[PDB]
Design a protein around this ligand. Structure first.
Ligand SMILES: Nc1nc2c(ncn2[C@@H]2O[C@H](COP(=O)(O)OP(=O)(O)OP(=O)(O)O)[C@@H](O)[C@H]2O)c(=O)[nH]1
Ligand SMILES: [Mg+2]
Lengths: 165, 415, 585, 570, 142, 132
């Protein structure tokens, strides 16, 4: 019933895990210039997913979903220590809005199959997620071709959505 | 003596409301429709409802409840006759009287209700004089509003001067199932369309039995006026003196006199029928219709209704003269003869079906009611003699008359 | 032959019912003349329009032949609308519904499970007991199969044929054995409803069915520990419908057994903790849990937690849960009478609720809350509540005060004090059946009739429109005027008992039309009684009898004649038969 | 939303404030709370438009009580608008000032009302006359202090009888609101002035000036006849309300006429055809008309004792008219019109209205009570209605034939031979016990009276008090009539009554019957078998002291209810 | 045991009646008009529970159209509300954004969802998928 | 006034956003300045409805020049819709991509056009030929 984003830096696997969530497949995906949108009926709750890519020209194009926005998922790329600092500054640019405050954070530790990746704890230290006031945030270790950790992020997201039994 | 005149819809919310004294609170109208359904479903449906110490005098329109509320001992027939006069005046104004007239023409109707009544007192309730200063298209009120003669304003002028008289018969009849007459009375009503100039005065001449007994000419043909109730315009003291119908006429269409008499002449159309009510199969109406009046008059557009069973099916009508439409919406037939002459008998044989299973409740046996209309004929034999136009100018008006025989409640009881 | 929805639009374009009935009877005669042609093509929509007439309440009794003909059709939609018309137009008392037997029987032997689904549907919804005896041999045959679409319908159809014929339940005992591991929870739900019904009917079936307690203990543990299901699931519980039905079968089983009640001990201890009082559903689960605890012979340690649950249920601001907690404490009145009594201030606080149902249940709960100790303080606020009631509560409260006072009266003086206070403050709202009960208890009193009848006369001098009050008072005067008027055969120093207004108050009741004429029967009975109880002022009531001989009532005319013959002819027999009436129980 | 409307109102254009106040009274039409827009439409009131100010006066009338403090801002405008060349706006402001019921306002409203009393145009004079009664309804003693009563008497002394008629209506209201201190009865010369005012004023004014005649009683035979000779032509009027009040004053004044003079019979014979003609009115007036006919035929039954054919009901008639026509046929059932009335009522049990059929069967019973001539034809007709075997028809006919048997028990001993079979599965306890009285009372020509009561004694302990007590009396009467057969029956009904039953009067009559049976059962042939007197029936004629009070109220709510007026007013 | 199922509008118009106890049509109109009079004359903080004539009556306001049932007064009461809510979800899943006119024009399909959800007064399918799937299969037979 | 239309657009119901975009193209029909509602009807474009997306492509054609910077949010949706089983929506997206004259967009529009040249159905082939 509730809406959600999937943003983050480009080539971080967020559309790969998106079409892993929709159909259960790892399909060939271009580096995403426009957007994607699907719907996932999960736990009897239609997770309406709004991917926005992380190309440099489309990073300023993020405010035009931020009208009527309820949640957030920020998909990180663990394997890029060089680009995680500019992804952090991009996240701090996105989270410095007076309009984006109902959007709870949901960090996806992605590409967790290569030995060069951080765990689900070093990413929080490099981001400083403990210093997040008014942000229900939760990091979760996700992988694309296995699909593990995606439904745990969906479970915590659904616990953030409903406040019922 | 009502404190607040109300008009509700068929649900119970205020179409229009008009308080006068404050004796009835405005919130007490909300109890009316629950009290209406509460008294109605127990057979206590009365024109006077009550909520503790607040009364509810009401007449009923097709879509409108003219609720008239009072708390103390109101003069009741005052209230109900004013309700009828409000209905008549608004029907003169708004020829259909519906919620579209109330919720949209609300500019004039509050002014009308303010003018017709103050403090619960009707003061001036004639339609035509109220037209002359309450318009929807304002000057001083006319003096005819203040005049003793308050039905005819001076200044009315026409090119021709015509007085149209409509003598309309209405045969009331209740024949039992045995075939004898229980009540054969006639309520006659003369309606006039007067187009004259100024302030005329009219003396109607009739072939009265009592007036001819006052004259000494009570051996010819005359009418036995058992009772007459006149309009306000007729000077009734002069009529009490010497049977004189002296009146300044109102302008336009108006009903002059509503007379009533008893008539021992045989009924106009006799309806004999036998009903072979078989169980769960069918029914038969071998109905015959003879006319007892003279062989010179022809009854226009009769509608001889026979009430039928409610769940009848496959209707059949072996008729002789006249068409039948079966009306199951009213659960009846309409045996329509357009030209029905006098002295003739036209047979009709009906045949229905009936469902094999019975109903939970009974249906009832309504009497037979026909809808005849006869021109150039009066069953009473009443004839207008003269009508003397009196005018200070002095001219020749045109007193024209036609004779119409219709029905009132022309009932004949069924088996 | 218009469509169904065309008639729907035709009726919705009607404003006045005086025109809407015309629009009904137009298309009704269309349907009637259509049924004279025996058309089997438009018969679907003709019967559908006729059912639309029956749904708003228009004459549709004639179109049941064609419902039977739609059941006697061969197409699926015709049979569908025919069984709809059979469930809507036909019932037990229709007298023409016995022709469905052969058609439902052939449609129970129809090849399609959906046509057999309809043949089970109509028979389960409205199958008469005569039809139950004619079809239950084939109802069990569709329970002898295993089609999970059909087993769920056959189980509740067996519930229906037990409901209409409770002496036919013996043939479903061998048919219900050990189908209690069916994975389809719908079939499992209907089977648990069937076992709850069978355990409700016969104790001979209990011993066969309290053996399969641990099987359904395992089933309920599997359903409680089931974290999630895609279907069956509202508010995160895998089929709480079946959970409540299993808890209800646990509630009716082991209610006088100890082995099975401890066989269900640990799953009740689990579900008292593995419920959730957040939404409506888990509160329903936990309330059925506490009902199962309080109805079986459980451990009282379960009842400690269960009374903690019900004390929480009183605290919930939802009026749902307040109704549930009042119904809860209304259920566990005799079971754990002690721990409910410490909810007493909350029970009295629920009397000031803004609901008819909550005031009613708190009133009856304070009524059942009466013991031999709370009779003093509670009855004061209960009669204060009766004084602050509404006229619909006054009959139930006036009965309940009397019923809780007849059991636990600490003092017969104060008992009659509370009774007389109720008889003042209620008046014409107490039931007339309680009047011989009050009469019987005050004649069970023997030492206080001076204090009774003096206070009776002090109250009834002001009022007689309170009809059961004078129903009491006329018999009280007629039986104990000698204790009312005491030692006053002639004129003495003025005491307020005056033996001339004592007769005149009854005579004023007689003359006044505020009299149900059993007021007058009691009053003339009192008059004939007080000719021997009083020797003070006699031969004035004989005047009343002699002038009363032409009254308009039948029995009162008989009563006046049969009195006047004694008062004028057999005065020696009057005092012979005017002994007090003996005390029964 | 309302600030936009107040901004339209606070403009200076006529077409803007005009649509603003039309939106205000349209919100008031459906009843929206436009009470908050009071003190600003107060400012938009003094306009040259006459159509606009009627809407404003409508608002002020509908919200006089709503703003009792803010309403002081209109008195200067009222005393200005009562000083206008147009009499329509003057009388409009006067009738506005009267309906505003605020006691803080009406102190300053005496003198412009006094001036508009003394105006030239009769329109504003007859408006101010009613406004005097409006203010007397607001404050009676302020009207007494200003002396408007004498000015009200001076508009009785006015010409152009509409002002006079509104003055008479206002005086009837104010003297009704009086404690009759300084009662305003007239000398007969002013009464003859009202008689000259009668042929000229309105048909509504012709009602109110006949309403003053309910407060005056003439002192002579020639005075009463002299005024009634011109009261008499008012009965030939189309409106039934003029006719009804004329009937009221003629019923009031016919108690002064000499019956031996031929004018009293002239009044009698000229009154009945108008009373028959008023039945042809429209049926909501016919309800009050039938109640007033019942008030008249109780007062004077000689009037309509020859007109029975007109009180037959019709199929189009509603329930409140069909039930009252039955009562008038009860009040007029005589010896010669028995056949038409009984065959008419025979065709009244054939209806689907249950209460109408019940009232019709009770009407046949009251016919059998009222006359002794056609009691037998009532018995034959009611037995033929029992032959219908309709359940409520039998449940009424048993009680009705019982009450026939109570008054006239004499020659009805072969009738009960049919009544033994009367659908013995009858359910209603008022007719079950009635049939028990029919059996036990007539238990000498009924031979199977014991075995039929075996059905009535089976479910004995839960029926009623009445049915069980009628059984308890009827079995004792049966056993006294036959001591051989019902020896066990009286003993078992005494055992069911005395021991196990706790029904107290049933217990008392059981112990009395048992002590009578044990003391001397032969003496019951004189005690319970005593010769019953002729039962004084319930004659429903209204008390002539109360009926003469209800002669003074014809056309009122008390005339309908057949009550004194103080019995229902508050 | 559910004795009856009633669905009446805010104005009082009967949109669906159901009788699991065979009482005649005059009694049907009496009881129906009484229940319609009772529920429409009660506020919005009254627990949606009425003890009416030995029945702990369960009604619920979801819209202007009011829903009404009565379980036997020995059972749990909140599960009847869950039954009505489950049937609301059944109408929403088979109809699709269930309007009043979807209930007005297509009432017989709501009767058939009721037939495939409850016979005899008791729940015959607790799945919210198998019942709508079976009625779409019976519609697939047509 | 347009915030109400954007609130209809930012809902999740098909019948609400459908009437919203019909009101958008009706304002565009008479020529109302609905250019401000560009980047939010961009989001309400990837639908399973085929009648709806023609209206959206009409808006994008009529406002390609109007929002040269905000138009980058459609290229992924175009290369998705050129990968559909329906050739009508593929050729529709191809003839949409050709009429959009923004030089910042048409850099990434070469290879899906090349693929739709090599499609099997002659409808999308003769569309892509004109799109060249
Ligand atoms: N080895 C490995 N590579 C992955 C995994 N997940 C994603 N990738 C790589 O990351 C690339 C990201 O693909 P996309 O999902 O299209 O990239 P994106 O995160 O959506 O970035 P944009 O499309 O530009 O928004 C994939 O092509 C993979 O090669 C993973 O689990 N394991
Ligand atoms: Mg991507």
């Amino acid at each position: 019933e509730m809406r959600i984003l999937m943003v983050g830096l480009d080539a971080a696997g967020k559309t790969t895990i998106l079409y892993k969530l929709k159909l259960g497949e790892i399909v060939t995906t271009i580096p995403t210039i426009g957007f994607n949108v699907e719907t996932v009926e999960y736990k009897n709750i239609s997770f309406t997913v709004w991917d926005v890519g992380g190309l440099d020209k489309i990073r300023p194009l993020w405010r035009h979903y931020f009208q009527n926005t309820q949640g957030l998922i920020f998909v990180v790329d663990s394997n890029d220590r060089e680009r995680v600092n500019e992804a952090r500054e991009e996240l701090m640019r996105m989270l410095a809005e007076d309009e984006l405050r109902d959007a709870v954070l949901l960090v996806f530790a992605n590409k967790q199959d290569l030995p060069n990746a951080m765990n689900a704890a070093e990413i929080t230290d490099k981001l400083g997620l403990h210093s997040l006031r008014h942000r229900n945030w939760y990091i979760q270790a996700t992988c694309a071709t296995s699909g593990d950790g995606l439904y745990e992020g969906l479970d915590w997201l659904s616990n953030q959505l409903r406040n019922q039994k | 003596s009502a404190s607040a005149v109300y008009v509700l819809d068929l649900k119970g919310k205020v179409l229009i409301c008009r308080n006068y004294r404050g004796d009835v609170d405005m919130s007490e109208v909300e109890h009316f429709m629950p009290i209406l359904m509460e008294k109605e479903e127990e057979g206590m449906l009365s024109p006077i409802l009550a909520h503790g110490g607040v009364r509810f005098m009401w007449i009923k329109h097709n879509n409108l409840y003219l609720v008239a509320t009072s708390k103390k001992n109101a003069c009741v027939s005052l209230v109900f006759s004013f309700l009828y006069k409000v209905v008549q005046v608004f029907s003169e104004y708004f020829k259909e009287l519906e919620e579209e007239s109330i919720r949209d023409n609300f500019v004039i109707i509050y002014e009308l209700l303010d003018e017709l009544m103050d403090f619960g007192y009707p003061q001036t309730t004639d339609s035509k004089i109220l037209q002359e200063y309450i318009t929807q298209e304002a000057p001083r009120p006319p003096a005819t509003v203040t005049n003793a003669v308050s039905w005819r304003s001076e200044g009315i002028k026409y090119r021709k001067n015509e007085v149209f008289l409509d003598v309309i018969e209405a045969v009331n009849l209740l024949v039992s199932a045995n075939g004898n007459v229980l009540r054969s009375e006639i309520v006659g009503s003369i309606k006039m369309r007067v187009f004259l100039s100024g302030m005329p005065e009219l003396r109607l001449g009739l072939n009265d039995k009592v007036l001819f007994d006052n004259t000494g000419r009570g051996k010819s043909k005359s009418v036995e006026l058992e009772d007459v109730k006149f309009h306000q315009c007729v000077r009734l003291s002069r009529f009490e003196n010497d049977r004189t119908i002296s009146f300044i006429p109102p302008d336009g269409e108006f009903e002059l006199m509503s007379y009533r008499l008893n008539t021992h002449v045989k009924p106009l159309i006799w309806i004999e029928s036998v009903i072979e009510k078989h169980s769960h199969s069918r029914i038969e109406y071998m109905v015959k219709a003879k006319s007892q009046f003279k062989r010179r008059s022809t009854a226009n557009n009769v509608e001889i209704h026979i009430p039928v069973p409610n769940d009848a099916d496959s209707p059949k009508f072996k008729t002789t003269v006249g068409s039948v439409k079966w009306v199951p919406e009213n659960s009846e037939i309409v045996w329509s003869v357009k030209s029905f002459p006098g002295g003739k008998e036209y047979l009709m044989r009906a045949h229905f079906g009936l469902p094999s299973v019975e109903a939970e409740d009974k249906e009832g046996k309504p009497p037979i009611s026909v809808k005849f209309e006869i021109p150039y004929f009066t069953t009473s034999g009443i004839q207008v003699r003269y009508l003397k136009i009196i005018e200070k100018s002095g001219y020749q008006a045109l007193p024209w008359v036609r004779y119409i025989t219709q029905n009132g409640d022309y009932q004949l009881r069924t088996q | 032959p218009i469509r169904l929805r065309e008639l729907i639009r035709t009726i919705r374009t009607a404003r006045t019912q005086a025109e809407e009935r015309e629009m009904i009877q137009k298309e009704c005669a269309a349907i009637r003349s259509s049924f004279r042609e025996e058309d089997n093509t438009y018969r679907c929509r003709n019967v559908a329009k006729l059912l639309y007439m029956h749904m708003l309440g228009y004459p549709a009794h004639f179109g049941q032949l064609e419902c039977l003909k739609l059941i006697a059709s061969q197409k699926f939609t015709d049979k569908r609308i025919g069984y709809l018309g059979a469930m809507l137009l036909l019932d037990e008392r229709q007298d023409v519904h016995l022709l469905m037997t052969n058609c439902i029987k052939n449609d129970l032997n129809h090849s399609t499970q959906f046509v057999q689904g309809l043949a089970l549907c109509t028979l389960g919804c409205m199958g008469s007991s005569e039809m139950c005896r004619d079809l239950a041999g084939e109802v069990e045959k569709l329970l002898k199969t295993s089609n999970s679409y059909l087993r769920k319908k056959a189980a509740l159809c067996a519930v229906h044929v037990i409901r209409k014929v409770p002496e036919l339940m013996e043939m479903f005992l061998p048919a219900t054995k050990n189908l209690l591991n069916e994975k389809n929870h719908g079939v499992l739900h209907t089977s648990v409803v069937l076992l709850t019904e069978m355990c409700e009917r016969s104790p001979d079936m209990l011993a066969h069915f309290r053996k399969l307690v641990p099987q359904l203990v395992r089933i309920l543990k599997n359903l409680i520990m089931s974290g999630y299901s895609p279907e069956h699931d509202v508010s995160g519980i895998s089929d709480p419908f079946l959970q409540v039905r299993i808890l209800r079968l646990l509630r009716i089983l082991g209610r006088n057994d100890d082995d099975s009640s401890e066989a269900m001990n640990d799953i009740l201890a689990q579900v008292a903790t593995n419920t959730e009082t957040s939404k409506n559903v888990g509160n329903a689960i936990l309330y059925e849990t506490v009902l199962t605890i309080m109805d079986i012979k459980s451990e009282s340690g379960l009842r400690v937690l269960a009374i903690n649950i019900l004390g929480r249920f009183l605290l919930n601001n939802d009026k749902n849960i307040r109704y549930v907690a009042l119904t809860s404490l209304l259920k566990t009145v005799q079971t754990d009478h002690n721990a409910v009594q410490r909810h007493r201030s909350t029970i009295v606080d629920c009397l000031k609720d803004l609901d008819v149902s909550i005031k009613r249940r708190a009133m009856e709960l304070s009524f059942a809350l009466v013991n031999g100790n709370n009779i003093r303080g509670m009855m004061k606020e209960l009669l204060y509540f009766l004084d602050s009631c509404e006229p619909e509560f006054k009959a139930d409260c006036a009965s309940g005060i009397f019923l809780a006072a007849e059991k636990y009266a600490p003092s017969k003086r104060w008992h009659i004090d509370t009774i007389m206070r109720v008889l003042t403050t209620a008046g014409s709202y107490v039931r007339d059946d309680a009047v011989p009960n009050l009469i019987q208890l005050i004649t069970n009193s023997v030492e206080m009739h001076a204090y009774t009848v003096q206070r009776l006369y002090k109250a009834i001098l002001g009022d007689y429109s309170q009809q059961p009050l004078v129903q009491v008072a006329a018999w009280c005067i007629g039986e104990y005027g000698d204790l009312l008027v005491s030692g006053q055969c002639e004129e003495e120093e003025p005491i307020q008992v005056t033996e001339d207004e004592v007769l005149d108050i009854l005579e004023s009741v007689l003359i006044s039309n505020m009299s149900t004429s059993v007021t007058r029967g009691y009053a003339l009975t009192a008059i004939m009684k007080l000719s021997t109880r009083f020797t003070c002022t006699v031969n004035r009531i004989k005047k009343v009898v002699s002038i009363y001989g032409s009254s308009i009532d039948v029995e009162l005319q008989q009563r006046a004649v049969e009195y006047n013959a004694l008062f004028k002819k057999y005065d020696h027999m009057r005092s012979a038969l005017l002994e007090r009436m003996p005390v029964m129980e | 939303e309302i600030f936009e409307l107040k901004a339209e109102l606070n403009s200076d254009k006529k077409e803007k404030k005009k649509e603003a106040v039309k939106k205000v009274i349209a919100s008031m039409t459906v009843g929206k709370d436009v009470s908050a827009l009071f003190p600003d439409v107060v400012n938009c009131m003094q306009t040259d438009n006459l159509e606009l100010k009627k809407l404003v006066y409508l608002y002020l009338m509908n919200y006089a009580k709503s703003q009792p403090d803010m309403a002081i801002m209109a008195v200067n405008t009222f005393v200005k608008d009562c000083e206008d060349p147009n009499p329509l706006i003057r009388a409009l402001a006067v009738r506005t000032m009267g309906c505003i019921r605020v006691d803080k306002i009406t102190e300053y409203l005496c003198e412009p009302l006094r001036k508009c009393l003394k105006d030239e145009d009769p329109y504003v004079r007859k408006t101010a006359a009613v406004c005097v009664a409006k203010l007397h309804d607001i404050n009676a003693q302020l009207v007494e202090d200003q002396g408007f009563l004498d000015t009200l008497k001076d508009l009785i002394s006015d010409s152009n009888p509409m002002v006079v008629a509104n003055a008479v209506a206002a005086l009837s209201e104010i003297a009704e609101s009086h404690p009759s201190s300084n009662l305003l009865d007239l000398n007969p010369q002013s009464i003859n002035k009202l008689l000259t005012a009668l042929n000229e004023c309105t048909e509504w004014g012709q009602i109110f000036i006949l309403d003053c005649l309910a407060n005056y009683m003439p002192k002579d035979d020639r005075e009463a006849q002299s005024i009634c000779e011109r009261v008499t032509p008012r009965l030939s009027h189309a409106n039934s309300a003029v006719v009804l009040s004329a009937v009221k004053v003629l019923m009031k004044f016919m108690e002064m006429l000499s019956k031996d003079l031929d004018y009293y019979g002239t009044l009698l014979k000229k009154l009945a055809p108008p009373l028959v003609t008023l039945l042809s009115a429209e049926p909501e007036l016919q309800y009050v008309a039938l109640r007033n006919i019942n008030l008249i035929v109780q007062k004077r039954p000689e009037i309509l004792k020859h007109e029975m054919k007109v009180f037959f009901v019709k199929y189009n008639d509603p329930i409140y008219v069909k039930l009252e026509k039955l009562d008038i046929m009860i009040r007029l059932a005589s010896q010669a019109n028995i056949a038409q009335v009984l065959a008419e009522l025979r065709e009244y049990a054939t209806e689907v209205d249950v209460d109408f059929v019940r009232k019709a069967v009770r009407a046949i019973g009251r016919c059998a009570i009222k006359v002794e001539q056609s009691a037998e034809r009532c018995v034959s007709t009611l037995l033929d209605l029992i032959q219908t075997k309709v359940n409520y028809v039998v449940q009424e006919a048993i009680v009705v034939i019982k009450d026939i048997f109570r008054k006239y028990p004499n020659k009805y001993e072969s009738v009960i031979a049919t009544l033994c079979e009367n659908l013995d599965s009858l359910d209603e306890p008022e007719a079950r016990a009635a049939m028990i009285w029919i059996v036990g009372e007539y238990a000498e020509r009924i031979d199977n009276a014991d075995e039929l009561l075996e059905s009535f004694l089976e479910g004995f302990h839960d029926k009623s008090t009445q049915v069980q007590l009628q059984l308890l009396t009827a079995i004792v009467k049966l056993f006294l009539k036959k001591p051989t057969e019902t020896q066990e029956l009286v003993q078992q009904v005494l055992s069911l009554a005395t021991q196990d039953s706790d029904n107290p009067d049933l217990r008392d009559r059981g112990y009395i019957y048992w002590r009578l049976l044990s003391t001397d059962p032969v003496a019951a042939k004189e005690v319970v078998l005593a010769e019953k007197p002729l039962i004084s029936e319930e004659t429903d004629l209204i008390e002539p002291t109360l009926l003469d009070e209800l002669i003074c109220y014809i056309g009122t709510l008390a005339s309908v209810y057949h009550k004194p007026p103080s019995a229902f007013v508050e | 045991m559910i004795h009856f199922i009633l669905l009446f509008s805010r104005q009082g118009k009967l949109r669906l009646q159901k009788w699991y106890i065979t009482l005649p049509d005059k009694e049907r109109k009496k009881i129906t008009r009484e229940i319609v009079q009772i529920i429409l004359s009660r506020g919005h903080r009254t627990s949606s529970f009425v003890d009416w004539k030995e029945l702990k009556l369960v009604y619920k306001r979801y819209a202007s159209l009011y829903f009404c049932c009565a379980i036997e007064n020995q059972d749990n009461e909140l599960l009847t509300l869950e039954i009505v809510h489950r049937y609301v979800e059944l109408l929403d899943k088979y109809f699709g954004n269930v309007c009043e006119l979807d209930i007005i024009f297509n009432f017989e399909k709501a009767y058939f969802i009721l037939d495939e959800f409850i016979i005899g007064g008791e729940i015959q399918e607790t799945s919210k998928k198998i019942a709508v799937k079976a009625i779409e299969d019976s519609d697939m037979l047509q």
